Amino acid sequence: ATAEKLPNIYPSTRCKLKLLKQEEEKKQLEEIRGNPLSIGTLEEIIDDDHAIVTSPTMPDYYVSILSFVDKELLEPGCSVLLHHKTMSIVGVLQDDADPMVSVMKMDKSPTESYSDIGGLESQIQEIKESVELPLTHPELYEEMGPPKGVILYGAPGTGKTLLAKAVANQTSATFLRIVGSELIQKYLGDGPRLCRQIFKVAGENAPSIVFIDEIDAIGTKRYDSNSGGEREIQRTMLELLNQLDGFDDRGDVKVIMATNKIETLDPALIRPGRIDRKILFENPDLSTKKKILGIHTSKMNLSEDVNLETLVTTKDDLSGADIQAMCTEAGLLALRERRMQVTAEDFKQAKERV
Amino acid sequence: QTVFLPMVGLVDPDKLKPNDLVGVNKDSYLILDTLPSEFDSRVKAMEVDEKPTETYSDVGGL
Amino acid sequence: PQLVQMYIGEGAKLVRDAFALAKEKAPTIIFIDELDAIGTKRFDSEKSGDREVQRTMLELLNQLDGFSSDDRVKVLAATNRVDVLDPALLRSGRLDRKIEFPLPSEDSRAQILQIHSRKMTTDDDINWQELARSTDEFNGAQLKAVTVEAGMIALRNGQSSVKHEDFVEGISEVQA
Amino acid sequence: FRLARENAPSIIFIDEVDSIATKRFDAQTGSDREVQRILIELLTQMDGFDQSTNVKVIMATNRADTLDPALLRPGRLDRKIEFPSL
Amino acid sequence: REMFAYAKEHEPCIIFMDEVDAIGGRRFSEGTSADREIQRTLMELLTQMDGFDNLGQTKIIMATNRPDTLDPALLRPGRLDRKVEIP
Amino acid sequence: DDKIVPLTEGDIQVLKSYGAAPYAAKLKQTNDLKDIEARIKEKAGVKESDTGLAHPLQVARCTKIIKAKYVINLKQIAKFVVGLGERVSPTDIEEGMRVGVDRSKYNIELPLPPRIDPSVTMMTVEEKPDVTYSDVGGCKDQIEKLREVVELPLLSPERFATLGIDPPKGILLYGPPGTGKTLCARAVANRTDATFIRVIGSELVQKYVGEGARMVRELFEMARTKKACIIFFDEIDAVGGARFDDGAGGDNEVQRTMLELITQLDGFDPRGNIKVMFATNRPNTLDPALLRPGRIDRKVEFSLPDLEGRANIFRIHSKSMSVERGIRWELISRLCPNSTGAELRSVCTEAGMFAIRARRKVATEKDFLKAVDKVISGYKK
Amino acid sequence: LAYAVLGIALIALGEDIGKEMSLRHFGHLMHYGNEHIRRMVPLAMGIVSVSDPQMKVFDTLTRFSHDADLEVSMNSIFAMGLCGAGTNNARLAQLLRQLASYYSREQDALFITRLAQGLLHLGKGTMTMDVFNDAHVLNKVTLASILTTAVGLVSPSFMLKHHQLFYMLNAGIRPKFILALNDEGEPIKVNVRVGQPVLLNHGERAELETDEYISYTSHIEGVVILKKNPDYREEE
Amino acid sequence: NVKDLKASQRVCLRSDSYMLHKVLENKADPLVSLMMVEKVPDSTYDMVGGLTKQIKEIKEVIELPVKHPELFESLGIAQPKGVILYGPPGTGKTLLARAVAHHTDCKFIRVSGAELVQKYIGEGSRMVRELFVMAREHAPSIIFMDEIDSIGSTRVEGSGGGDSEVQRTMLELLNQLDGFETSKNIKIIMATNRLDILDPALLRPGRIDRKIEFPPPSVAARAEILRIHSRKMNLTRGINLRKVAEKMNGCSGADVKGVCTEAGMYALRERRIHVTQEDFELAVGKVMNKNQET
């Protein structure tokens, strides 16, 4: 019943919304603008209430806004309403788009939740406390403050990758995942711009979760700045460091570091007092493995021949992925068996393969 | 844009020669003036301090 | 750096630009700082890597090649040290004279510090040679730096005049 | 190219096409934008046009790495020949 | 070609190309700096040389201060029949 | 359901009120004139361009007046210079509303600057930084000289002239980068309210050539515009330092970009007003031409004093945190070796979670001891 | 529009967790060049400030202190005392250290700062106002205490009368409060999970706590009275 | 509408009114830079036939995931989002990929690997998303990286810092395909006969899940592939293909084609749309010349 009343309520809202007298006045304000008008890009600004512009055809005319909307709403080098006469700024014009930055996984409150990934919790506190904790922002207030970022280690797809979005999901900020090998280019200086573009986003879309994976390459100080040593290595990293060592947060924009090559990196690349956090994924001990086991093992359908301990003890200290991985091809064997309920044998097989 | 013209009034065949600055009616493509080569770019960022006064007493020993 | 451009041979154009209008203002001394900027052709057929800095040199060389007798055109190129050599880089009508600028001797520094100490208010606790001796191979301004620092020092000393100790303290301000 | 089809049978040869071989790989501003199109054109025209061959694309190469498989696409540049032989 | 053709009409003409490593030479990674401009230009001669265009009465002097700085294909006969040393 | 729908019922009617309301004064006011005035006003201004079909400006098209056109085109259509003789126009050369030289200068002024710059400053400058005393905690010895290098000459230029001198015209900062380092620059920048140019050498080398050269000029240009300004470089190591990588041959411009920076900063730039400041990890990397006096005079570490400095720094930091007043920062400071006025937050800042793990308001000694341990062990770097 | 400029001023009060627009809109409202806004929004922020005030404009008030007006400053000192009265730092961060860095450029500033820094430390710097409370019902006692102060509390400001206007908010003014009470229920030892600050005895300070222990009806943030597990049972 | 509208849209604009006169067919759209997309290419797997154990494995790792993923969801796994093939090189190995990809009805992509990490900064990089971008658009879409896989028709033998950087550039993308996406039957085929050149983290599940590996062939496979390519070209009986494939050795499926071509090339030079066996028997050598040549 009330659904009807709810629907028309939604409807009446649409009406008033569309109802934006003022309409004429608004149209009067449109009837001002005339039409059709001309796109054109900003360049600089003065209080002049005249400013000149930028065009692909490149007329650049010194022009006023039609003033109700604002100059300060916009930045130099931005497309603006222009007439076709003088290309008069008609007002605030987006120039919305900018849907690109260098190489990233563009995602927010991502799929991975710490529940999902198999129990890693011992280090989840690390990532939770350093980030998720100030993400609540409540206690961190009294805490007086929160580190910048963390450093993952161990294996991706179990420790490194799975954890990565866990708190990223949990805090529900903008999770930005990248690889340094997803930077460069071998050329000099946009590696920074890559970061910049990223940091543009990072600065822009805050809160966000910065992620970084496998700095094997852009991060190695070597011993030398010369004799074949590619500047861009440091040249990038330093700038990445500049925005890194130029920012830590109280719980807004959070960083993640995922890689196995550790001291390839500068100490201030960590800059303790800022990055306090090393996550390192290990082979989960039989219990902790069992912790992840029961998760992925059970979520895999199977026949009661299967047992965790049947799998648990038989193991070499696998990765928490190999859990998944054994579990993975395990059913694949049952698929090669063309069955929907997996035996215990496939598991041992699938593991002793993988 | 290339136009022919009977050589215009304000110019001299010696003034005339390829690669030159010339006043030309833009519309008519009628050459008005010969122009000296002057604002042929000084890449004005090119910094000419004209013969500034500095001694050899400025930095000795040399 | 201006001769260093995105446009292809922009520099050469610039160089030509630099050449010509200067040839009007000639007699002209064209000063060039750190020629090695444009002073490396590399070794190779990869030279388009920087064709600019090269050809601009080459263009310049050709300009230096274009004339001999014009003293109207004077060409002055400084580097810390040159990289590549050319008998263009040493030539009558091209760069002729390879001119050393050795970091001065001490009395020479005492000579230069003089000029720097010159405009300074001083009580003449000064002895230059001392300073000059204590100093090593300062291109003028390090003396001037000492001169500079000694002054700030001398103010920190309250002294309107600057004294030897002040300069000693400019030196004392780590010269390495 | 069409004129050759207008003149069919005919020949299309290109001296050392590599001048146009690699397009803008990046935002290359001037003169690299057309080497896109010109190539893309030729690509379009190789890659897009009939096999009833009255005219054969022929291109010299000293250095082929500037090129791309879009030329080396089958049906288009089928037959490589190499100037050398001990 | 104006350099060719004018000379080709105005032949005999001597063509002297200064120290040609910016518009000559094998370039770098042979990537595109606008190098694609050079290669063309590099080739434009090649086209006039390895191409049927001859030196009718107009001749071409190539200039370099270092020879090894040039396209190997440029050095080739059909383009260059003389590599002029100046010891 | 039902009772909630009562709230939902209230929701609908409430919204209808504004809907009913909004229509009311809507009838009253009946918006041409905010603009159509200004529009038609500036339509004159528009037309003030539109005759003859016409702060970076880039290009003035002030177009096609032949008697006369009085404009520069720096652009591939009809490049123009008004000069050759005495050539002006009383207020304004001509039109576009654009009146002026584009950027590229032809004669002078002419119509007051139409100018200046494309790409804004792609470099960007925060004046009066958010740091005045911010990281200034524990940073004294440095700033002690910085103030001399920067603050006092900005304060009382006369003294140095009264002496007959200038401040140190350029200065080095090294150690952990920007850590308070840049901010410390930003500090005295905002301490003195001088114009603080944060330009990273990262900005300097880009896809093209004359890159920072272009910048460094515009830098040095708007240096003098912003005069009494701090040109500040973190990552002198970005462009690199002294090197022979010109022997490789590709680096040359990057090298020159320094030499650019090198060249121009040397001769004409007032560094008593326009401040030049450098931040690196490695002072060992310098191109000595940088280390030259009258280019770089003062040279300073960031730095990492003693037990004592840290305490205050700690004491400085922890004031953010709720902290146990019994335990001594001296106690904590004793334990740790010397480390960064950034890292010393790991002392404090980490303990907050300790304080939250220990669920204290006020972190205990061990809370920091552990942190000291935890962090410093957690380094292993 | 004159006191339509007051339009969203009363809206600050309301206000509920939103409040959402206030802290976000307040920054826009206050910036409106009309002083009647620039007067009132700083005032209006107060219950917002203890229920949802601005986080950025806190500094901006410092900027606009002398911008077009010294009464803005006279407010910007006073207002920061207001919003910073007993609500201190955290959400309110950018406001109060400026009062801690507000002392005197003027004996009236000093007057207002002494006012403000008094207000700053009003309630030993720990207070909060939410007229509604977690008993799931709003309070119109204090609601009456407020627009009273709008036409009033004008001793510096427009609608000006006199100085005694300052306290009319006290009809609801509460501390930063967690009231944590025992199973018998006049003040006695009892405790919670951690605050900042410890296990909170009968009425000991914090704000908006979700704790271990259970209230009696509808466990909540805020005031919670404490019963404990019969096995583990305690006054706490 | 405004809503019927789209960007880039080909439209009649009222010329001097500069308003839409009407809308035209928008034209669009793949791209280049060596990330370009051929969209659901065609081949049929029988044509390299005899490999089918692999094909079946392939079908099992791709087609059955593609054709009915939920069978594996019914099983409750994460089915392969990328695939490997490892063994004898150069049968027209692309066919292995395309034919399945064809069969799958998935855009089958080719990309030059090292063009994702270059000198010039960010363009090798920006391509990465756009690659990933269009990938999901026309999904289900199979991706294949050129210049990486060692299966031997597309083999460049990878690169150490070059395409390790690229495959990692793929790997996070792969991990991105393991991301909030979880969009599957988008399969990057990394089908290759040498892994060591690559980060085995590529072997980690979610990237290469079901790890399957190719295997060299022989006369029979050749004879089949021969009888497949010889099939194509116009012929004449008296012709035992095996004998040719017997004469064939150290030969591959792609190499077989060249044999056929030469047989025709012979026959064409013989002025024949009618090919004998003898011709093939020569091409064997002529190709096995080349096979033995460089």
PDB file of N, CA, C and O in Angstrom, chain C residues 34-49:
ATOM      1  N   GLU C  34      78.832  26.371 -20.822  1.00  0.00           N
ATOM      2  CA  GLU C  34      78.890  24.913 -20.902  1.00  0.00           C
ATOM      3  C   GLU C  34      78.518  24.429 -22.301  1.00  0.00           C
ATOM      4  O   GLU C  34      77.483  23.817 -22.540  1.00  0.00           O
ATOM      5  N   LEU C  35      79.424  24.750 -23.219  1.00  0.00           N
ATOM      6  CA  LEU C  35      79.297  24.308 -24.598  1.00  0.00           C
ATOM      7  C   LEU C  35      78.959  22.830 -24.686  1.00  0.00           C
ATOM      8  O   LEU C  35      78.133  22.426 -25.514  1.00  0.00           O
ATOM      9  N   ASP C  36      79.561  22.012 -23.812  1.00  0.00           N
ATOM     10  CA  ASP C  36      79.354  20.568 -23.871  1.00  0.00           C
ATOM     11  C   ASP C  36      77.885  20.204 -23.860  1.00  0.00           C
ATOM     12  O   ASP C  36      77.532  19.091 -24.262  1.00  0.00           O
ATOM     13  N   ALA C  37      77.035  21.113 -23.400  1.00  0.00           N
ATOM     14  CA  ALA C  37      75.613  21.033 -23.664  1.00  0.00           C
ATOM     15  C   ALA C  37      75.400  20.627 -25.099  1.00  0.00           C
ATOM     16  O   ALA C  37      74.919  19.532 -25.401  1.00  0.00           O
ATOM     17  N   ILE C  38      75.773  21.539 -25.992  1.00  0.00           N
ATOM     18  CA  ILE C  38      75.733  21.268 -27.420  1.00  0.00           C
ATOM     19  C   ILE C  38      77.046  20.710 -27.926  1.00  0.00           C
ATOM     20  O   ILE C  38      77.205  20.520 -29.138  1.00  0.00           O
ATOM     21  N   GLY C  39      77.986  20.424 -27.032  1.00  0.00           N
ATOM     22  CA  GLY C  39      79.315  20.022 -27.437  1.00  0.00           C
ATOM     23  C   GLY C  39      79.582  18.536 -27.525  1.00  0.00           C
ATOM     24  O   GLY C  39      80.742  18.125 -27.508  1.00  0.00           O
ATOM     25  N   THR C  40      78.554  17.712 -27.631  1.00  0.00           N
ATOM     26  CA  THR C  40      78.749  16.280 -27.805  1.00  0.00           C
ATOM     27  C   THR C  40      77.986  15.822 -29.037  1.00  0.00           C
ATOM     28  O   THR C  40      76.752  15.869 -29.060  1.00  0.00           O
ATOM     29  N   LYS C  41      78.720  15.375 -30.052  1.00  0.00           N
ATOM     30  CA  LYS C  41      78.128  14.728 -31.210  1.00  0.00           C
ATOM     31  C   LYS C  41      77.987  13.237 -31.002  1.00  0.00           C
ATOM     32  O   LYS C  41      77.648  12.530 -31.942  1.00  0.00           O
ATOM     33  N   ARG C  42      78.272  12.753 -29.804  1.00  0.00           N
ATOM     34  CA  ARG C  42      78.589  11.356 -29.579  1.00  0.00           C
ATOM     35  C   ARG C  42      79.684  10.893 -30.518  1.00  0.00           C
ATOM     36  O   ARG C  42      80.574  11.653 -30.917  1.00  0.00           O
ATOM     37  N   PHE C  43      79.582   9.620 -30.866  1.00  0.00           N
ATOM     38  CA  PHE C  43      80.495   8.906 -31.730  1.00  0.00           C
ATOM     39  C   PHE C  43      79.920   8.487 -33.070  1.00  0.00           C
ATOM     40  O   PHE C  43      80.685   8.086 -33.955  1.00  0.00           O
ATOM     41  N   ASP C  44      78.613   8.594 -33.262  1.00  0.00           N
ATOM     42  CA  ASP C  44      77.939   7.519 -33.977  1.00  0.00           C
ATOM     43  C   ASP C  44      76.995   7.948 -35.083  1.00  0.00           C
ATOM     44  O   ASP C  44      76.872   9.131 -35.391  1.00  0.00           O
ATOM     45  N   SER C  45      76.339   6.978 -35.703  1.00  0.00           N
ATOM     46  CA  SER C  45      75.219   7.251 -36.586  1.00  0.00           C
ATOM     47  C   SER C  45      73.901   7.298 -35.826  1.00  0.00           C
ATOM     48  O   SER C  45      72.842   7.398 -36.454  1.00  0.00           O
ATOM     49  N   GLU C  46      73.960   7.213 -34.491  1.00  0.00           N
ATOM     50  CA  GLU C  46      72.841   7.396 -33.572  1.00  0.00           C
ATOM     51  C   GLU C  46      72.663   8.853 -33.177  1.00  0.00           C
ATOM     52  O   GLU C  46      71.846   9.164 -32.301  1.00  0.00           O
ATOM     53  N   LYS C  47      73.429   9.740 -33.811  1.00  0.00           N
ATOM     54  CA  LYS C  47      73.530  11.139 -33.426  1.00  0.00           C
ATOM     55  C   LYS C  47      72.210  11.889 -33.466  1.00  0.00           C
ATOM     56  O   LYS C  47      72.072  12.903 -32.774  1.00  0.00           O
ATOM     57  N   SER C  48      71.234  11.428 -34.247  1.00  0.00           N
ATOM     58  CA  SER C  48      69.921  12.057 -34.193  1.00  0.00           C
ATOM     59  C   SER C  48      69.356  11.984 -32.784  1.00  0.00           C
ATOM     60  O   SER C  48      68.384  12.680 -32.465  1.00  0.00           O
ATOM     61  N   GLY C  49      69.961  11.151 -31.930  1.00  0.00           N
ATOM     62  CA  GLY C  49      69.566  11.031 -30.543  1.00  0.00           C
ATOM     63  C   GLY C  49      69.471  12.413 -29.952  1.00  0.00           C
ATOM     64  O   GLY C  49      68.411  12.804 -29.463  1.00  0.00           O
TER      65      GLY C  49
END
